[PDB]
Write a protein that binds this DNA or RNA. Structure first.
Lengths: 50, 277
RNA sequence: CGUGAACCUUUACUAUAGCUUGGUAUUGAGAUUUGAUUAAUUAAUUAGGUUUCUAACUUAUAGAAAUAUGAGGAGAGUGCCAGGU
RNA sequence: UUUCCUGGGUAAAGGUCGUCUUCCCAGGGUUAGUCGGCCCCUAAGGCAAAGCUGAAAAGUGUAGUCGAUGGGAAACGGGUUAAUAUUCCCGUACCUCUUAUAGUUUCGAUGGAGUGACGCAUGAGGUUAACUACUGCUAGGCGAUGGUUGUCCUAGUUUAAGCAUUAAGGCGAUGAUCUUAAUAGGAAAAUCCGUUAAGAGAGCUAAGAUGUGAUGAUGAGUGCUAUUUAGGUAGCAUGAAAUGUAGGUAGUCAAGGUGCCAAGAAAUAGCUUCUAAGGUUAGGCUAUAAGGGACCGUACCGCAAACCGACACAGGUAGGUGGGAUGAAAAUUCUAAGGCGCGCGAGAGAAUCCACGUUAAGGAACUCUGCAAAAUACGUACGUAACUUCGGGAUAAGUACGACCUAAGCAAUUAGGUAGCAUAAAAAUGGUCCAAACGACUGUUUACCAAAAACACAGGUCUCUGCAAAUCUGUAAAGAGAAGUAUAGGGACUGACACCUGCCCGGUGCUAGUAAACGGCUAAGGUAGCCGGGUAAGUUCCGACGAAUGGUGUAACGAUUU
RNA sequence: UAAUAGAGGCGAUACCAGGGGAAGUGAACCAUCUAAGUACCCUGAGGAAAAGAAAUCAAAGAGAUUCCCUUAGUAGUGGCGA
């Protein structure tokens, strides 16, 4: 059964990448929150996939 | 013009008719320097929502740059090169080749033929295809492609088989009977094209099957009584109701006779007698 | 069952989008008689009715803009107040 | 994302064991001018100075700039390593340019124009990889057991890009290259305006074929040393054994040709060409010689224990290769190359569960129900009703034949002989008819209990809207509608087609009227139409409410109901 | 276009100022009200901010602004219900 996570890469980087996060207000809030919490991974761009 | 019918070799062909394209200089590809490829619309707007429903994916078509505004080419005769099929509108398009070398498209009137010479301006003769300001066109003629504001182009009647009737002239204005049937005043300096628009069998066609309706880019229409009350004021069809309510649009606006034109519009001065039901 | 929750409907109640009417600001100058009121038909104001000219204002073309030309018009549009839906 | 290769090891983990593993540890492994990106271009789309619109945050949106699954310069064969190759090597091509030399002349822009540039259906025709039909030709065998040194058997007989030669076919003489006069083009032009007076002009495109590439490489085999399960296998040498005919698939010619309407991307790239400001070896073109290749990906899995399903999971998983025999075919079955023998097994077979095979007599008597099974099935012929919109119904129904050998015959098939219980001998490959209900029919939906009578639908009717339209989303701007224009757009209703669709304006909607409005039938009381048979035995079935939330019929159709 | 000068963002899941501003509740319902300028959003800077030297308080004779103790659960307000 084709299911929930057909894994593209251009979709991954475009929709959830660091530049897509910085591109708007809420994404920058996301980045600040994750920095404050001290996450080891900020965005999907830490998975080097292009 | 003409209608071509089909023998019923399938249950869908029994009532399919199409036009016959004999009055068309066939075998034609559009002029490469006047047509550009384009998307198909499907009725979504800049925000991305659907603003007009029930419009979908038809046949891919190019856009032909028409010219409803022949004003900047007054006094310059041109030649009719060909009569071509246009997918973006009902009527056919004529390709005029001007004496200075520029080529343009116009709406093809009824009864012109290849090789004719067409002229635009106050001095042009009264001949089918010529464009003249309403000043110069005599009372009692039939025109089309009427301009509404000087320099705007033909914004009035344009569809296949239509024409407008000049009734009277007075002051700055000319009374014109439009195809809907109302009598409207037009400023006398706007231009118009003489004669009816050809291709008058366009609407005598019986489409024949749901597939062709899909080709024409028309998605299916879902009635209101087939809905649920969350979806449409008419919903609730537990055994085929009729709405249980005076008929309304999907947004609550009444639909059987309700008049939606604004009650104090700016153009009310220029409408003599509205159309008839 | 709980003075539970949510949804839906209606000629249940109460608000309100939107629509619509009036007044006013935007909003000027003319002509005319419909009047009311105040005194002596006359005179001073004022609501209107029928019309006019464009400079406010807004439609078309050219232009980045400015600006120009061709048409509408103190209307319309937009605020505020009030009356309906 | 190291799972790849080599070596070592078995805490765990592998549904068991384990010397093994995609497990663990160490080491090693991915070489590019020709591949895929990067790059120069644009589709949808995103951002977007200015302008405009909004408490803010922003929303719209022009000039522009980004955005491939698209369009654009260049390479093929063979070999080598424990693992990597159109990347290294051997042999052999091609495209870009930096400088210089020598035949030299109009170069120069984000600007203008052309090319770039396109659909579907569908024959037929020209050659062809692979493959078999036959023969030569090489290599081996010449067969524990009847015959088999010859119409014997087995295997092979291979080889590209590029260059050179030519040219099936298509488009062409209705004009395809060009040579000048005029220039309403917006930068102005010796190009494009392809618009017009001439009158000189048939070529363009193109698979394929041959040679070269190539006495090269490859090569079934044969030859030495080691190994050995006595079977072949590790290095290592050597070897055209036809670049034969016939048939011809899949491309390809072909973005072709012929027809149809639903009339079938853009490019500021590339190619070609044009002129301004500026230049007159400053450049450019035609050649030669020399060297300049960016940056990144490059292993392996990739129909699976390496991707996505919590798993080493009966799932999903793009595209190009698709052998041979049978056959019309990629069906069915068998089989070559190649890849595997499902990661708990072994004894006994009790009942029973589940999935199947066979059957005396009867043949739906079982059961809510011919549910499920059984059976029918192909090819070639004969023969096909009622009804009907004349298209269909229809493969209606029903009937005959099919092996082998010989002969006839282009072949289907015919005739004779012969064999069997069976002779479309395996498998695959429709059960049909009659009557009724509803729906016209293809189709679509309840992902995960409803595939239907529901929706969709062609058609018809009513109503709204004159274009800075109505309408829809927004406080707005703005956009959609629409680069559209009443033969149009939006909404409601009905639902192919045929006959009909009547009465009522009180009430409620809409602008006294309007019912193809909500609705009713005193405002007006509804117009048309809508026991018999079957069975021995039949609560089933068949025959004797209500008119555009539609009434009554109807050919054809249906994984529908009876 | 040129010239310098001051800003962009982060940090404090703290504080302050300005703008926007709910809903769960209580009133044993709810619509007034309450919760509440609460949460949160957005725009600003500072080390504090804001405010700050009376056209004021208020019937006492005081004298800028802000923060405490009292006045005081008082004066009033509230479908005079909470």
């Amino acid at each position: 059964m084709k299911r929930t996570y057909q894994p593209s890469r251009v979709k991954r980087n475009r929709k959830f990448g660091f530049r897509a996060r910085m591109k708007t207000k809420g994404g920058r809030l996301i980045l600040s929150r994750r920095r404050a919490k001290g996450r080891m991974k900020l965005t999907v761009s830490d998975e080097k996939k292009k | 013009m003409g209608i071509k019918t089909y023998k019923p070799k399938t249950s869908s062909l029994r009532y399919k008719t199409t036009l016959s394209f004999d009055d068309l200089s066939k075998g034609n590809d559009p002029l490469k320097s006047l047509t550009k490829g384009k998307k198909f619309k499907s009725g979504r707007d800049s925000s991305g929502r659907i603003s007009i429903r029930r419009r979908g994916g038809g046949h891919k078509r190019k856009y032909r740059l028409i010219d409803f505004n022949r004003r900047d080419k007054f006094s310059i005769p041109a030649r009719v090169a060909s009569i071509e099929y246009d997918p973006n509108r009902s009527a056919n398009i004529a390709l005029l080749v001007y004496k200075d070398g520029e080529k343009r498209y116009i709406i093809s009137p009824k009864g012109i033929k290849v090789g004719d010479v067409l002229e635009s301006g106050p001095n042009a003769p009264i001949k089918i295809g010529n464009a003249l300001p309403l000043e110069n066109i005599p009372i009692g003629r039939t025109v089309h492609n009427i301009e509404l504001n000087v320099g705007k182009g033909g914004q009035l009647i344009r569809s296949a088989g239509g024409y407008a009737m000049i009734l009277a002239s007075d002051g700055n204005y000319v009374t014109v009977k439009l195809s809907s049937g109302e009598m409207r005043l037009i400023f006398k300096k706007c231009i118009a094209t003489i004669g009816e628009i050809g291709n008058e069998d366009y609407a005598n066609i019986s489409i024949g099957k749901a597939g062709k309706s899909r080709w024409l880019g028309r998605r299916p229409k879902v009635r209101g009584v087939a809905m649920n009350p969350v979806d449409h004021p008419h919903g609730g069809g537990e055994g085929k109701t009729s709405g249980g309510r005076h008929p309304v649009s999907p947004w609550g606006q009444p639909t059987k006779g309700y008049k939606t034109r604004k009650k104090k519009r700016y153009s009310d001065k220029f409408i003599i007698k509205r159309r008839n039901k």
